[PDB]
Amino acid sequence: MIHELLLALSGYPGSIFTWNKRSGLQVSQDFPFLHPSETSVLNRLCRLGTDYIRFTEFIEQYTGHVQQQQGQGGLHGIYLRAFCTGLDSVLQPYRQALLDLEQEFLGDPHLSISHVNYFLDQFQLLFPSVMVVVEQIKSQKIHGCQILETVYKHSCGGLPPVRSALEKILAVCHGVMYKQLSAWMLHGLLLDQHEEFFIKSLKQFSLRVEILPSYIPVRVAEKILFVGESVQMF
Amino acid sequence: VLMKRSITAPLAAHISLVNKAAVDYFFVELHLEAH
Amino acid sequence: QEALHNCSNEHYPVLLSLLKTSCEPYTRFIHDWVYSGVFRDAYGEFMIQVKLYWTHGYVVFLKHIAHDIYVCGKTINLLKL
């Protein structure tokens, strides 16, 4: 029951915590050798594993599923892959924690489930918090640059771990924009087609307030457009 | 990404030399201007 | 074409290491007809293949350099005849 929870929690659901997809993990039920006092702690810990299995499934699903061939930035698109890239390396301390738990259980096998619970409760708040960002991106069909503002509005809050955790992901998805801008400004070459890096001679080149980040004002964007067109012409 | 700035330069430096020397081979030797 | 399409992914170095040696014999074939005047075709897989002298065929690498090589070899090959 002890080791089984760790295996379920890493993403290998057992014959005790039976994974469905419409309900996540579920215990096998009341038996006369168990009663609710341990059961509730186990369920509360099982929440985080439900979320974790969903996360790994999504990251796997959108990174490494094509040799890259439309207008799609949400079933495809470089920004979605960049988010999926950021999310797993932010998820690295969870794996490190589970790894720690196995070692402690090896040292003394009589350690409680509450012993697990208090160590993992630094994650108990942060794991619901990051979920609404990915849920927003999936539900509202948020693509292109719009993913940045979706993360950025919740990276101006008042909880330090949520802020740092979201900050690393925003660095990655900034990185794809920076990689396109680093060539287009000095040469004019773009690597993206049917996606925007918020700028789409003197025609076929369009600038829009809608695609541009809200937290980056219009004035710098107009200068960027001016630089790219100027170098492109001569 | 791929780029040609260390590939095409030591190639085009010989392409242009060959083409110009062919024009010169016409004129200072075979005298097309005389014809 | 996968290289200029994407380079912001973890599978960039593997595909780069594949292409870096898969482009190696083609570079040699381009490096032949221009520097030594020897036309060297492989299997039809090399892009250029073979009185008035119009007896060489011509039927993604950049086409902006293709015709320049195509004329840079044939003058020396005419001097061979």
Curated annotation (Swiss-Prot), chain A:
Disulfide bonds: none
Domain of life: Eukaryota
Subcellular location: Cytoplasm, Cytoskeleton, Microtubule organizing center, Centrosome
Tissues expressing the protein: Ubiquitously expressed.
Protein family per UniProt: Belongs to the TUBGCP family.
Disease cited in the entry: Microcephaly and chorioretinopathy, autosomal recessive, 3: A disorder characterized by congenital microcephaly and chorioretinal dysplasia associated with poor vision and nystagmus. Variable ocular anomalies include microphthalmia, retinal folding, retinal detachment, optic nerve hypoplasia, absence of retinal vessels, round areas of chorioretinal atrophy, and attenuated electroretinogram. Most patients have mild developmental delay and mild learning difficulties.
Function: Component of the gamma-tubulin ring complex (gTuRC) which mediates microtubule nucleation. The gTuRC regulates the minus-end nucleation of alpha-beta tubulin heterodimers that grow into microtubule protafilaments, a critical step in centrosome duplication and spindle formation.
Self-association and partners: Component of the gamma-tubulin ring complex (gTuRC) consisting of TUBGCP2, TUBGCP3, TUBGCP4, TUBGCP5 and TUBGCP6 and gamma-tubulin TUBG1 or TUBG2. TUBGCP2, TUBGCP3, TUBGCP4, TUBGCP5 and TUBGCP6 assemble in a 5:5:2:1:1 stoichiometry; each is associated with a gamma-tubulin, thereby arranging 14 gamma-tubulins in a helical manner. Gamma-tubulin at the first position is blocked by TUBGCP3 at the last position, allowing 13 protafilaments to grow into a microtubule.
Protein name: Gamma-tubulin complex component 4
Organism: Homo sapiens (Human)
From Swiss-Prot, chain B:
Sequence similarity: Belongs to the TUBGCP family.
The protein's role, per its UniProt record: Component of the gamma-tubulin ring complex (gTuRC) which mediates microtubule nucleation. The gTuRC regulates the minus-end nucleation of alpha-beta tubulin heterodimers that grow into microtubule protafilaments, a critical step in centrosome duplication and spindle formation.
Lineage, top ranks: Eukaryota, Metazoa, Chordata, Craniata, Vertebrata
Species of the source: Homo sapiens
Entry's localization field: Cytoplasm, Cytoskeleton, Microtubule organizing center, Centrosome
Protein name: Gamma-tubulin complex component 6
Superkingdom to which the source organism belongs: Eukaryota
Disease with which this protein is associated in UniProt: Microcephaly and chorioretinopathy, autosomal recessive, 1: A syndrome characterized by microcephaly, cognitive impairment, underdeveloped retina and choroid, and epilepsy in some patients. The more anterior parts of the retina, near the periphery and pars plana, have a grayish hue and diminutive vasculature similar to retinopathy of prematurity. Visual impairment becomes evident during the first year of life.
Residues in the signal sequence: none
Quaternary state and interactors: Component of the gamma-tubulin ring complex (gTuRC) consisting of TUBGCP2, TUBGCP3, TUBGCP4, TUBGCP5 and TUBGCP6 and gamma-tubulin TUBG1 or TUBG2. TUBGCP2, TUBGCP3, TUBGCP4, TUBGCP5 and TUBGCP6 assemble in a 5:5:2:1:1 stoichiometry; each is associated with a gamma-tubulin, thereby arranging 14 gamma-tubulins in a helical manner. Gamma-tubulin at the first position is blocked by TUBGCP3 at the last position, allowing 13 protafilaments to grow into a microtubule.
Interval of the full protein contained in this chain: 1482 to 1516 of 1819
